RNA sequence: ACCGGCCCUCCGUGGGCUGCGCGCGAGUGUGCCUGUUUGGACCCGAAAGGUGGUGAACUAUGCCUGAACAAGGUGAAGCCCGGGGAAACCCCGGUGGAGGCCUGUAGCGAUGCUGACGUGCAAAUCGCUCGUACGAUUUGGGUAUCGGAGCGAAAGACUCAUCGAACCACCUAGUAGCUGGUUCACGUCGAAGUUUCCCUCAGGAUAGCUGGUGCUUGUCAAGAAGUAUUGUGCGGUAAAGCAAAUGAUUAGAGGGACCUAUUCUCAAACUUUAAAUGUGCAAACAACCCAGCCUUAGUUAUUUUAACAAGGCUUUAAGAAUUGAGGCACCAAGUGGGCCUUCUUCGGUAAGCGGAGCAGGCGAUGCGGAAUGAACCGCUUAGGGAUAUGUGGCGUCAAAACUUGUGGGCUCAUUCUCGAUACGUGAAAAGGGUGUUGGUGGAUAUCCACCGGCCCCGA
RNA sequence: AAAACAUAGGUUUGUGAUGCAUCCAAGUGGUGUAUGUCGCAAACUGAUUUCUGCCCAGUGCUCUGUGUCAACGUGACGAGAUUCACCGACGCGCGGGUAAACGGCGGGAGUAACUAUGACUCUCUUAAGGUAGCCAAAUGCCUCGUCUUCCAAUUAGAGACGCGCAUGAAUGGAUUAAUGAGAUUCCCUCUGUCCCGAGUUACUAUCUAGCGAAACGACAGUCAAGGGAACGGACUUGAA
RNA sequence: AGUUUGGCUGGGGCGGCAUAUCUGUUACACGACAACGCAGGUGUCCUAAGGCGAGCUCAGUGGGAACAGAAAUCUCACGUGGAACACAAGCGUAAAUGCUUGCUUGAUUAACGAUUUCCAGUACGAAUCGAGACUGCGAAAGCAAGGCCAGCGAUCCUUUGC
RNA sequence: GUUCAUAGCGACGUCGCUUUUUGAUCCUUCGAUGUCGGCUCUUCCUAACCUAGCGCCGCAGAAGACGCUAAGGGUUGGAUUGUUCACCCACUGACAGGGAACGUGAGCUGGGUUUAGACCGUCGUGAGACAGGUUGGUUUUACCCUACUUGGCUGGAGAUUG
RNA sequence: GGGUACGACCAUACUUGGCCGAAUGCACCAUAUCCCGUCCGAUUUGUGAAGUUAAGCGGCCACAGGCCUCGUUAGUACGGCGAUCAGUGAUGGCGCUGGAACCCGGGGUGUUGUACUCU
RNA sequence: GCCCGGAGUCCGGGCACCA
């Protein structure tokens, strides 16, 4: 088994990523960072809900995978499968080491790569979900259950922007009528004279 | 420039090196203290090494000549008398007294109680029990073999309570980077556990920190400053970026790979950009200008430059520093195990763990506070009065509100018992509460959602 | 005090005296030897019974005809020191012998009418590839191996099995009547070993008369918690 | 008979080399900084892979040509270095420090000149700026006394040159 | 779990407690703090096995599962093994888990571990080695202070005085 | 208002496309006896004027890219010094003080020295 | 390093060692 997560909670070391110097790294537990209807035009989902961290700490890849499974399961059961789209915005790039105990003691104690984790900051957004205005109570409950899989303190807020887009929610449909917006996939670009 | 020595060239009134050289002498004898070295070497201490002698009365083994060993059991060879048989030969009964034979005294030993005693009767003894007891048996006197040697039915056993190398005297006060000790008073000063080298890591040499003796001077300040200001240089950490190069990486879109523009998320060994704190130089007299002048084998096609000089001239508002003794030696001690802390930081799950950076401490140091504590807070110390504070306090212990205010709120806590001085984690989490007390946003003439304070469950 | 040593029995080696072993500073010096192979000196194994397999590649010991190895000799150049050339033994190399000298003595595949196993085959390789025997043995890690017997119950004992980490033949193998203050298991008898302790005796201790030490001894001697060199008699607070 | 039988070290031993040395990072934007901290190298190689002059442009991509294809050779265009520079890494470089070619021996001697790095401001190794001789390549200015920075060694003794 | 997330469980995750395991460290003790197990004896803790009283169930009864107050009382006899541990037989209401210098050697015992003798296997040329097996192997002193158990003498309120 | 030769700073000067270009000049351009060099007078070398601004070159323009400058981001991120400061912690604000970066928005698209020269 | 032997020369032997 792996050690309890209390042994890797605080950001005590330099980032230490996977590179040509650190090679024998196991694969992270989470591989997909999107659930729900990814192929949805930006106009379909106008409501966005965030969960944002309030601590400076590390979150393991197992916890991210546990949160993804729980959030998807509740939305599918309590609502339609296609009525939402969720994105995980924390990728595990920090490698953790372990010193497994022919020599004995603390001699030559540099460890071997064992797992991966994500380093988060205060005010950073961890998960983002966009949905319709009639499924907000379901989205809030699903995110509530998901955040119970993380260490530390997190808060749940509703954004003032149109879903996954940097344009204010009330002012989006004016700039859509008067064609000042160029649609590129899931985001939009403000057209300017240039 | 001159003396000695080694040289170079275009060979001259060149050139460049070297001496513990010279450059109007400073040595020498003696007294005294301190340091280095050898000697017993400040005092006491090994395990060892060598030279010459004394021991076989303990004990080991051989030899000469003497002494000793109750009482029983078993019953070998030889011999006698009877039977059986054709022979070969076989059988009974006696007698006899063999044996590194058996039971068992004396003798010679020492298995168990892991008995007694264990400052004893005794530096190995005592009580029961036990091995053997005609044999490779026990024992007196005499004699023979020893110290790197003797002897051994062999255990490194024994050689006078001494043996994996006896005893006595001497070399010998053997050497010890290691342990222990080292005897009067007051006064002036006062550290280091770091650098480089060492068969170096419990030790030295070397520089640094310190003391003594000074020298040359100055007196408001020279060759002053762990500090500013002004001017002028240096930089790639924190941050930021990936819509910029290198590396890693998620997803849609427009024309299954592919292309274009975007997009989520990153970097100690990535970077266009780029701080704060830092770091170099300058801010006047052995100096700078101005003018004229001399010299050269330097530069230049010549002047003009370069360098060394000599006689005259000038010079000590704008936030616009402020503090004050400068420089130079000689001789020598201790130290060369360090530890703690704010902040920065590497290894480790972590540690009262291991290892670094700038600074301050303890060590070497008390005093006043945190009840108690090397390092925390205050303050740092000649012997004493008066006055006032610092940290911390004013219910009693215990000096101070003889329980201060004519100031607001909040809290009720049943068996490790609510809470109450930081450092000190030197006691606590996720998650909950229609306990009570405050806010924010919505609805209606009180209802919903969310966020705090103290208390309660988790414990 | 033994399973160790010795022992009888067994095997091997040297040696015909101007010898083999060997003392010793030395000599017409000394010991086995007052002896003479049925003797003396040097090793190993350990009664009897039945046996003692294969290996001379390594190391050692030992026996026979030309590369190398020292001084001494014999010639040269040179004025001479110096130098050069040739000759030069045992030994070491070559060639034999020797294991009751020291010692050593294998892997991997396939294969028989249900499965299993493998008499059979192939392959790599050695100086030789462990034979007769014996075993979870005082030698077996795994291991308290697996089966039977002994008990109500056995990591124990005995009897079997054997790809044996790492058994094995005078580094002796296997077996043995008699013997043992040798190690282990079970049975009968017996009991204060125990269930579970009780009563009695003699000498002490205990009191007295006489006599009369030693060890040890910073100072001393009630606790709880705290902090402290992280387990206080002393310090802080409390309680006696 | 005499003497010896390394050291460091989260005890010692086995292991390893942190024992003499080079590059990046830890390292906190001057310099300096530890660990048996991380990622890697060194005891060699080269008469050319040294010196200079000249000419040229690399990696790669796209459009074209019998056999010929994803990949052979020829041609045009783009191409800030994404190639190469003996080897580890960093820095550096485009009519060049790269590639080809021509000629050469500055990889010699160099009067004890001065200096940097480690540092006691000692030595050793490496490197920087000069003076003199004789030369090499260039029309000349000029460049060169090795291959830039790692690749090595006291007293005594032996041996060679003048 | 006939359905039913939560009677009883609960994956993927995440937050803690304890010092009855073993590691990590090297602060105290090397002019010595007697090192396994058993026997004997006392006391403490609760994370409750039995005994008292209750709630709840997928509690009809009987037998049970889960939880609460509660540590007053109780918690065995044997075969094998040095064992702690382990595993069987049997009784019982029940045969709970732990601490006290891994309680307890001037209280015992000495089977094991760990000297000197000796045998075996493997290793080593050898002397010898093995956290492999085997057999044999001295357990010393209390009369001191305190603590505890019993046993006696005797003052004293300004706790000796005013 | 210009050309040529030699330059300094080295993108406000570069990259792409389009348009225009009076004269002097600069070019493209003709050819291989000789000097010289190539597989090839392509480049290079030696000798002429037959044609032409086609290209090179100069000037202007582009909701052009890039580059330069000023604002904004923002007193934000980060920092030096202090507390018997808050918080179980992770961390954070406060006092005295220093102070960024990209995106984004406005503007701009070479300056100039010596000599010989054309209008 | 010396003497050889076998292939201008690489191996196999018997000897010898003060930086
Ligand atoms: K002395
Ligand atoms: K004697
Ligand atoms: K008899
Ligand atoms: K007897
Ligand atoms: K020193
Ligand atoms: K015996
Ligand atoms: K005996
Ligand atoms: K015996
Ligand atoms: K014999
Ligand atoms: K036999
Ligand atoms: K008496
Ligand atoms: K008396
Ligand atoms: K008496
Ligand atoms: Mg655990
Ligand atoms: Mg002495
Ligand atoms: Mg000696
Ligand atoms: Mg005698
Ligand atoms: Mg007898
Ligand atoms: Mg006894
Ligand atoms: Mg007798
Ligand atoms: Mg012995
Ligand atoms: Mg002395
Ligand atoms: Mg002392
Ligand atoms: Mg003083
Ligand atoms: Mg040395
Ligand atoms: Mg950063
Ligand atoms: Mg010193
Ligand atoms: Mg000290
Ligand atoms: Mg103080
Ligand atoms: Mg008072
Ligand atoms: Mg005895
Ligand atoms: Mg026999
Ligand atoms: Mg026998
Ligand atoms: Mg042989
Ligand atoms: Mg052997
Ligand atoms: Mg054969
Ligand atoms: Mg066996
Ligand atoms: Mg056995
Ligand atoms: Mg039994
Ligand atoms: Mg058996
Ligand atoms: Mg064998
Ligand atoms: Mg044999
Ligand atoms: Mg054997
Ligand atoms: Mg007998
Ligand atoms: Mg016996
Ligand atoms: Mg106490
Ligand atoms: Mg005491
Ligand atoms: Mg710095
Ligand atoms: Mg630096
Ligand atoms: Mg060139
Ligand atoms: Mg070099
Ligand atoms: Mg020169
Ligand atoms: Mg060079
Ligand atoms: Mg002591
Ligand atoms: Mg003691
Ligand atoms: Mg004691
Ligand atoms: Mg314990
Ligand atoms: Mg104990
Ligand atoms: Mg005892
Ligand atoms: Mg005991
Ligand atoms: Mg005791
Ligand atoms: Mg034993
Ligand atoms: Mg302070
Ligand atoms: Na770390
Ligand atoms: Na007898
Ligand atoms: Na000491
Ligand atoms: Na024997
Ligand atoms: Na042989
Ligand atoms: Na066999
Ligand atoms: Na058995
Ligand atoms: Na050592
Ligand atoms: Na309880």
Å: A5 CA to B65 C1': 102
CA distance A94 to A116: 5
- Chain D bases near protein CB atoms (7 A cut-off): 9-15, 36-39
Phi-psi category of residue A152: left, alpha or beta, with phi > 0 → left and psi -120 to 50 → alpha? left
- Angle between helix A136-147 and helix A61-78 axes, rounded to 10 deg: 150
Give start and end residues of each alpha helix (H) in A14-114: 61-78
Close Cβ partners of A101 (under 8 Å, ≥ 6 residues apart): none
- Residue A90 vs residues A30, A161, A165, A176: alpha-carbon distances, Å: 11, 21, 18, 31
* CA A65–ligand 7 middle distance (angstroms): 81
DSSP state of A27: P
Q: State, as a whole number of angstroms, the distance between the CA of A116 and the C1' of D91.
A: 35
CA of A21 to the centre of ligand 4 (A): 86
Token code pair at residue A27:
């694969």
Length reported for chain A = 194
Nucleotides of F under 7 A from a protein CB: 63-65, 89-92, 104-105
Taking Cα atoms as reference points, which of A5, A4, A2 lies closest to residue A152? A5
Q: Which helix (H) or strand (E) holds A127?
A: strand A125-131
Tell me the CA–C1' distance in angstroms for A172 and B440. Answer: 28
CA of A180 to the centre of ligand 19 (A): 112
| Residue A107 beta carbon within 7 A of nucleic strand D | yes
| Cα A190 to Cα A193: distance, rounded to the nearest angstrom | 10
Q: Is A69 left (phi over 0), alpha (psi -120 to 50) or beta?
A: alpha
Distance A28 CA to C131 C1' (A): 64
Instruction: Collect all residues with Cβ–Cβ distance below 8 Å to A66 and sequence separation of at least 6.
Output: A149
Resolution in angstroms comes to 2.5
Of A145, A159, A147, nearest to A120 by C-alpha is A147
Write out the two tokens for A116: 């991966």
CA A132 to chain CA centroid, nearest Å = 20
Report the C-alpha gap between A84 and A49 in whole angstroms.
11
Print burial letters for A165-179: b (CB count within 10 Å at least 16), e (below 16).
bebebeebeeebeee
Please name which of A110, A123, A130, A109 lies closest in space to residue A42, comparing C-alpha atoms.
Answer: A130
Give the Cβ contact number of residue A25 at 10 Å: 16
Long-range CB contact pairs, A167-170, < 8 A, 24+: A169/A46
Distances (CA, A) of A34 to A17, A28, A30, A131: 23, 16, 11, 14
Longest dimension (CA), chain A: 74
Helix intervals (H) in chain A: 61-78, 136-147, 172-177
């Amino acid at each position: 088994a792996r050690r309890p997560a209390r042994c890797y909670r605080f950001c005590k070391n330099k980032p230490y990523p996977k590179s040509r110097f650190c090679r024998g790294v196991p694969d992270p537990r989470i591989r997909t960072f999107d659930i729900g209807k990814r192929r949805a035009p930006v106009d379909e989902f106008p409501v966005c809900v965030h969960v944002v961290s309030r601590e400076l700490e590390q979150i393991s890849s197992e916890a991210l995978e546990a949160a993804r499974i729980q959030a998807n399961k509740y939305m599918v059961k309590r609502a339609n499968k296609e009525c939402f789209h969720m994105r995980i915005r924390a990728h595990p790039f920090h490698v953790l080491r372990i010193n497994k105990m022919l020599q004995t003691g603390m001699r030559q104690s540099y460890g071997k790569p064992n797992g991966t984790c994500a380093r988060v900051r205060i005010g950073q957004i961890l998960l983002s979900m966009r949905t319709k205005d009639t499924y907000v109570p379901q989205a809030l409950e699903s995110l509530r259950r998901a955040k119970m899989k993380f260490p530390g303190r997190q808060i749940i807020v509703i954004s003032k922007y149109w879903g996954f887009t940097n344009i204010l929610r009330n002012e989006y449909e004016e700039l859509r009528d008067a064609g000042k917006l160029q649609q590129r996939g899931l985001h939009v670009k403000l057209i300017t004279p240039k």
